[PDB]
Structure 1
Amino acid sequence: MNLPTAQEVQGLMARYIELVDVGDIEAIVQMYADDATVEDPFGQPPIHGREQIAAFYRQGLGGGKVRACLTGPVRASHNGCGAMPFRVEMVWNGQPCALDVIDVMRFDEHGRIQTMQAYWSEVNLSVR
């Protein structure tokens, strides 16, 4: 693949959720560019490179008990970017928690996620 057209952005971003949804940490990290960055949550400094991004997803996913699902359609541009709304269900002190998130991604000219920014803070964390 080259720089993903808008339909290509959509399928990639939905796969990405499918991988979070099963917790294939290594297939996730192989969707990123070797020198990608992750800002998650957006505002905290960035995480550079596949090693660090791998350490980030293992800590987040390698537990407890994380599921994820789109909560509306992916919105894709014609320059290989996109944004998607989703909800992450996890376990916290045995209490089922959920977190509403939007991730923005910019891809590269091979269909690899070049930057990801995840929008959320505690206003989107609803403990039940």
Structure 2
Amino acid sequence: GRHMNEFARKKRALEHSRRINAGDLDAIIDLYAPDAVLEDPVGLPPVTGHDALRAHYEPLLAAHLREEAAEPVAGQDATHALIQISSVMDYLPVGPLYAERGWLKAPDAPGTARIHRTAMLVIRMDASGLIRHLKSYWGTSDLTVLG
């Protein structure tokens, strides 16, 4: 008994990419419901609630995570927006964790290498515009170690 229209969900999905690029942690977290569930990537155990979300985004902000997002689409189901995201960030300090997980090799800078990743996000939003659930789909074949 209340919901968010396609355009607001769409803009909201673009705002998530926007705030990630702006690098302010407080703003990124504000987009999530207090108990929001993040799967990044889908296939690994979910990150849930604000404190865990902060700890998830901090290393990404340290690696200077940079996203260029394509135009999102919307579901006709009152909650969803999907968006494709191309991303670049430094190998450090996240890369070694992706290496340990089995997702990529290990460059030879590594403090000058960068990582490219392609992902498609499935985003569930409630009537307040808060993200209740975000699934970031990307595999090892969507993960590349650049220069």
Residue 84 of structure 2 is matched in structure 1 by 85
Residue 122 of structure 1 is matched in structure 2 by 140
- Secondary structure at the aligned position of 2:83 is classed as strand
Distance 2:40 2:128 in 1: 23
Residue 3 of structure 1 is matched in structure 2 by 3
Residue 74 of structure 2 is matched in structure 1 by 76
Residue 26 of structure 2 is matched in structure 1 by 26
- Verify: 1:46 aligned to 2:46, yes or no: yes
Structure 1, unaligned runs of 5 or more: none
State the 1:127 CA deviation: 2.0
- Secondary structure at the aligned position of 2:144 is classed as coil
Residue 105 of structure 1 is matched in structure 2 by 123
State the 1:4 CA deviation: 1.9
- Secondary structure at the aligned position of 2:42 is classed as coil
Identify which range, 32-41 or 94-103, moves more after superposition. Answer: 94-103
- Secondary structure at the aligned position of 1:82 is classed as strand
- Secondary structure at the aligned position of 2:145 is classed as coil
State the 1:22 CA deviation: 1.8
- Secondary structure at the aligned position of 1:57 is classed as helix
TM-score, with length taken from structure 1: 0.91
TM-score, with length taken from structure 2: 0.80
State the 1:45 CA deviation: 1.3
Give the aligned length.
Answer: 125
